[PDB]
Design an enzyme around this catalytic site. Structure first.
Site, PDB file in Angstrom:
ATOM      1  N   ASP A   8      31.320 -21.237  43.872  1.00  0.00           N
ATOM      2  CA  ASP A   8      31.348 -21.504  45.325  1.00  0.00           C
ATOM      3  C   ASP A   8      32.173 -22.766  45.625  1.00  0.00           C
ATOM      4  O   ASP A   8      32.130 -23.745  44.912  1.00  0.00           O
ATOM      5  CB  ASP A   8      29.904 -21.741  45.848  1.00  0.00           C
ATOM      6  CG  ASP A   8      29.717 -21.342  47.334  1.00  0.00           C
ATOM      7  OD1 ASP A   8      30.196 -22.116  48.203  1.00  0.00           O
ATOM      8  OD2 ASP A   8      29.121 -20.235  47.629  1.00  0.00           O
ATOM      9  N   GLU A  58      35.812 -18.881  44.908  1.00  0.00           N
ATOM     10  CA  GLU A  58      36.001 -18.943  46.354  1.00  0.00           C
ATOM     11  C   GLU A  58      36.630 -20.282  46.568  1.00  0.00           C
ATOM     12  O   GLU A  58      36.039 -21.342  46.266  1.00  0.00           O
ATOM     13  CB  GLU A  58      34.690 -18.907  47.090  1.00  0.00           C
ATOM     14  CG  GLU A  58      34.895 -19.164  48.561  1.00  0.00           C
ATOM     15  CD  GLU A  58      34.644 -20.593  48.974  1.00  0.00           C
ATOM     16  OE1 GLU A  58      33.460 -20.972  48.843  1.00  0.00           O
ATOM     17  OE2 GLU A  58      35.578 -21.288  49.464  1.00  0.00           O
TER      18      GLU A  58
HETATM   19 MG   LIG Z   1      31.679 -22.758  51.350  1.00  0.00          MG
END
Ligand SMILES: [Mg+2]
Ligand SMILES: OC[C@H]1O[C@H](O[C@H]2[C@H](O)[C@@H](O)[C@@H](O[C@H]3[C@H](O)[C@@H](O)[C@@H](O[C@H]4[C@H](O)[C@@H](O)[C@@H](O)O[C@@H]4CO)O[C@@H]3CO)O[C@@H]2CO)[C@H](O)[C@@H](O)[C@@H]1O
Ligand SMILES: OC[C@H]1O[C@H](O[C@H]2[C@H](O)[C@@H](O)[C@@H](O[C@H]3[C@H](O)[C@@H](O)[C@@H](O[C@H]4[C@H](O)[C@@H](O)[C@@H](O)O[C@@H]4CO)O[C@@H]3CO)O[C@@H]2CO)[C@H](O)[C@@H](O)[C@@H]1O
Ligand SMILES: OC[C@H]1O[C@H](O[C@H]2[C@H](O)[C@@H](O)[C@@H](O[C@H]3[C@H](O)[C@@H](O)[C@@H](O)O[C@@H]3CO)O[C@@H]2CO)[C@H](O)[C@@H](O)[C@@H]1O
Ligand SMILES: OC[C@H]1O[C@H](O[C@H]2[C@H](O)[C@@H](O)[C@@H](O)O[C@@H]2CO)[C@H](O)[C@@H](O)[C@@H]1O
Ligand SMILES: [Mg+2]
Length: 755
Positions: A430, A483
């Protein structure tokens, strides 16, 4: 080696097999060294020694007996190797069981650790059951170079460690063996820092922990608690390219998928524990164990036809509401759901059912809780000292000092530890930007540029590259997903090519474009056909994962049904069309729990999902829809073999923005596997709508999202349609279709159908 020596081993007469098996130094040359690795592998026909970090494989030869193997290798250091072992028609890859004679730390362990390159440091730091000076006990060891003193406290000495002070080595690590204790021992490190202060710490390398909010580490016999059955899954994985396979991920938060009753014990694998209450405000509810999840989640997912489950972080974390993204026991799966062996069982059962496990991993930061890593030895040990790079002020967490060797090491070994001990098949990271940028969420004058006056966090980039280089060398065939939300280039390209070395990247632009698009009243979608098509402009610069994640259905964004305009019928229709488009668009797939049955309410991490909605027809129908879609996805090569090549996709036409229609082709190796996909993104059906195809024949309707079995109106082409020799969108042939309302069609040519 001699035949008498071999036979001592085969017939179990040898006094100490560590003298012969494992890696032993044969001689030192000017620049390099000569080593021998030996293994006794009954039932193996053949073996190899892998040197993953040098990217080499050398065969081992039988010597004196067909199951006794030697391999001689010349290389300067031989720290990192694996054995590849072939038993009949199967191959497994393992660490050498005879790699480490001694439970204690050697000069070699320490040196390697200080350089930051001990990829197995977790075998020696932490707590391990072991024998020293002839006595069964536990060896404990911990990095705390600036501590004044350190002891071990726990059940066994009622939390007073005056008599269990630890010896400090090389001004860096503290060690101690304690006899007659075993696994289950509850304990922490009593540290006194440079100012007399005497705080307690959870074991950074600890393998199990008390249930939050308690934080004592617990000693695990980690290599002797569970028996795996996934040799074949692991072999298939290692020899496959997952980028050319189907990958539809069901993202899950273990703590909030389904709850049980707190008026009963939590079952485990051959045992049971006291229930863990999900909160003080919902005290009638408990979490399910890894064991119970293996029994309920896995066949549910199997049924839905997803290839992978991705878990929000299961490393031990103190606060439910962090979702797992604030970790303090990086080396243990959370005790909320039971024991390490229970999670092993969970992963083993996934593998038995043909399902991969991906773990969200959190190397970017850690919270300030004083049981954990912060100010560990009375200095900024794990975190950078300067809060302009060492703190995330908006989150109130600390950033790892990536340039510090023993820290890099803690993390680089940690990622490898999950693949080694728990056999997982991928990781995701993340919020990668938060590692990449010296200026991350900091305004002018509260951040210093790098050496060359850039914003780039150089130590971070280099940690990431190392992590990914190493992962793929040690466990080829895995997924390393990122991400990263700032346009940083070459995220999912190899380190060699100046990439960060992940192999997939969430397409966050595509996610914003699609949810923005579907949220608009259909009539106005004509003004925004570019939402539909833009993602294909930059698509080939990365290997993309199309993710619609947990982040998009909290904090007032709504669940997926609630994002959609119109009545109940049109809302389910829009979900069907969006997801059909998602599954046909190039890239891999990820979607979050509750989306597959149409939950109304936002994801609430304090409760469980609204399973009672599955008592009702529309929710059932939507679930069947996803079940068939996943089944199709796996069944049709064009939907997964060429996600990342130009060959794999071509638009047929995307200019009818007035009717919010688009259409395209997907292709695979075999041209008879090519598919034609047509999307109609308003509720206005069309009746003799013409779409260019590139060859003559009967195109079967493989899939129609308006089928009544899915909740649709049942408009369609009645099973398929013959092409016309009528040129269109620059193509020799064409189809004259019914476009159902708010719906997507997938057609394939059946080139052996009766004309
Ligand atoms: Mg984020
Ligand atoms: O079969 C005769 C009709 O066939 C075609 O109708 C289509 C519509 O054009 C599509 O939009 C869709 O209709 C949806 C409609 O969009 C949706 O809002 C909803 O309407 C319901 C509504 O829920 C209900 O409360 C009340 O208004 O009744 C409506 C039911 O008709 O649901 C509709 C789907 O059931 O699909 C239909 C059927 O395929 C054709 O276009 C029409 O001209 C024709 O009369
Ligand atoms: O009224 C019933 C009519 O149905 C049929 O017309 C359809 C076509 O079959 C569809 O393909 C579509 O038309 C789209 C077209 O596909 C799309 O490419 C675009 O066409 C632009 C073109 O791209 C551009 O380069 C230039 O040439 O102008 C074109 C005209 O706009 O947009 C079209 C729609 O605007 O939908 C129509 C119905 O609207 C049937 O073939 C018709 O003969 C019939 O009358
Ligand atoms: O049955 C007694 C008691 O058992 C359990 O408490 C244990 C704690 O959970 C465990 O952490 C440990 O507590 C120590 C702290 O971690 C430490 O920092 C230091 O301050 O000493 C504490 C122990 O004195 O040990 C206890 C004792 O077993 C359980 O949680 C309780 O409900 C129960 O009362
Ligand atoms: O021996 C002092 C000090 O050395 C190590 O630190 C390294 C550091 O990791 C590097 O990034 C670089 O800046 O140089 C330092 C000196 O070699 C240890 O990390 C530290 O614990 C120790 O006390
Ligand atoms: Mg509930």
């Amino acid at each position: 080696i001699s035949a008498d020596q071999v036979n001592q081993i085969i017939y179990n007469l040898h006094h100490d097999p560590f003298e012969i098996l494992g890696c032993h130094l044969l001689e030192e040359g000017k620049n390099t060294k000569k080593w021998v690795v030996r293994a006794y592998l009954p039932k193996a026909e053949a073996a190899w020694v892998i040197r993953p970090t040098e990217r080499k494989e050398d065969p081992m030869n039988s010597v004196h007996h067909p199951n006794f193997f030697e391999c001689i290798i010349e290389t300067p250091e031989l720290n990192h190797y694996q054995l590849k072992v072939k038993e009949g028609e199967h191959e497994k890859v393992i660490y050498d069981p005879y790699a480490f004679s001694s439970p204690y730390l050697t000069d070699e362990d320490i040196y390697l650790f200080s350089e930051g390159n001990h990829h197995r440091i977790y075998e020696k730091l932490g707590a391990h059951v072991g024998e020293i000076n002839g006595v069964k006990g536990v060896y404990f060891a911990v990095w705390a170079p600036n501590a004044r003193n350190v002891s071990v406290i726990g059940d066994f000495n009622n939390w007073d460690g005056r008599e269990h002070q630890m010896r400090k080595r090389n001004y860096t690590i503290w060690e101690l063996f304690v006899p007659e204790i075993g696994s289950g021992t509850v304990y922490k490190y009593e540290i006194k820092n440079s100012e007399g202060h005497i705080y307690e710490k959870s074991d950074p390398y600890g393998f199990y922990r008390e249930v939050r909010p308690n934080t004592a580490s617990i000693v695990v016999d980690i290599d002797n608690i569970y028996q795996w059955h996934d040799e074949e899954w692991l072999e298939k994985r290692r020899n496959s390219d997952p980028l050319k396979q189907p990958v539809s991920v069901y993202e899950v938060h273990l703590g909030s998928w389904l709850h049980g009753s707190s008026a009963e014990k939590m079952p485990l694998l051959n045992g049971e524990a006291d229930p863990v209450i999900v909160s003080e405000w919902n005290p009638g509810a408990r979490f399910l164990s890894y064991y119970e999840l293996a029994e309920k989640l896995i066949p549910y997912v199997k049924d839905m036809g997803y290839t992978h489950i991705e878990l929000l972080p299961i490393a031990e974390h103190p606060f439910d509401g962090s979702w797992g993204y604030q970790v303090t026991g990086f080396y243990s799966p959370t005790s909320r759901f039971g024991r390490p062996e229970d999670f092993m069982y969970f992963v083993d059962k996934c593998h038995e059912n043909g399902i991969g496990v991906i773990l969200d991993w959190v190397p970017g930061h850690f919270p300030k809780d004083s049981h954990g890593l912060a100010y560990f030895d009375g200095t900024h040990l794990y975190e950078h000292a300067d809060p302009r790079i060492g703190e995330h002020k908006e989150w109130g967490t600390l950033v790892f000092n990536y340039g510090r060797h023993e820290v890099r090491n803690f993390l680089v070994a940690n990622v490898l530890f999950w693949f080694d001990k728990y056999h997982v098949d991928g990781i995701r990271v993340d919020a990668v930007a938060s590692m990449l940028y010296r200026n991350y969420l900091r305004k002018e004058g509260e951040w210093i540029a790098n050496e060359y006056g850039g914003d780039e966090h150089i130590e971070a980039v280099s940690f990431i590259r190392e992590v990914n280089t190493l992962l793929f060398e040690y466990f080829p065939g895995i997924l390393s997903i990122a991400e990263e939300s700032t346009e940083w280039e070459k995220v999912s390209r190899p380190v060699a090519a100046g990439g960060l070395g992940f192999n997939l990247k969430w397409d966050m632009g595509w996610m914003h474009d699609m949810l923005d698009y579907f949220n608009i009243d259909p009539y106005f979608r004509q003004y925004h056909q570019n939402n539909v098509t833009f993602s294909m402009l930059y698509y080939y610069n990365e290997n993309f994962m199309l993710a619609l994640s947990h982040d998009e259905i909290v904090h007032g964004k709504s669940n997926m049904l609630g994002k959609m305009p119109g009545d109940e019928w049109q809302k389910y229709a829009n979900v069907r069309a969006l997801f059909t488009y998602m599954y046909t668009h190039p890239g891999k797939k990820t979607m979050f729990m509750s989306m597959e049955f149409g939950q109304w309410s936002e994801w609430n991490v304090w409760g469980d999902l609204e399973w009672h909605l599955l008592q009702y027809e529309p929710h059932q129908q939507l679930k069947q829809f996803f079940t068939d879609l996943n089944a199709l996805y796996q069944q049709e090569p064009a939907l997964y073999t060429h996600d990342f090549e130009y060959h794999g996709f071509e638009w047929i036409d995307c200019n009818d923005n007035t009717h919010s229609v688009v259409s395209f082709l997907r292709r695979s190796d075999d041209p008879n596997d090519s598919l034609v996909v047509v999307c109609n993104f308003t509720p206005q059906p069309h009746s003799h709508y013409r779409i260019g195809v590139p060859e003559a024949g009967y195109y079967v309707e493989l899939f129609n999202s308006d089928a009544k079995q899915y909740g649709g109106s049942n408009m369609g082409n009645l099973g398929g349609k013959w092409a016309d020799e009528w040129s269109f969108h620059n193509k020799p042939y064409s189809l004259d279709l019914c476009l159902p309302p708010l719906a997507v069609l997938i057609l394939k040519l059946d080139p052996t159908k009766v004309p």
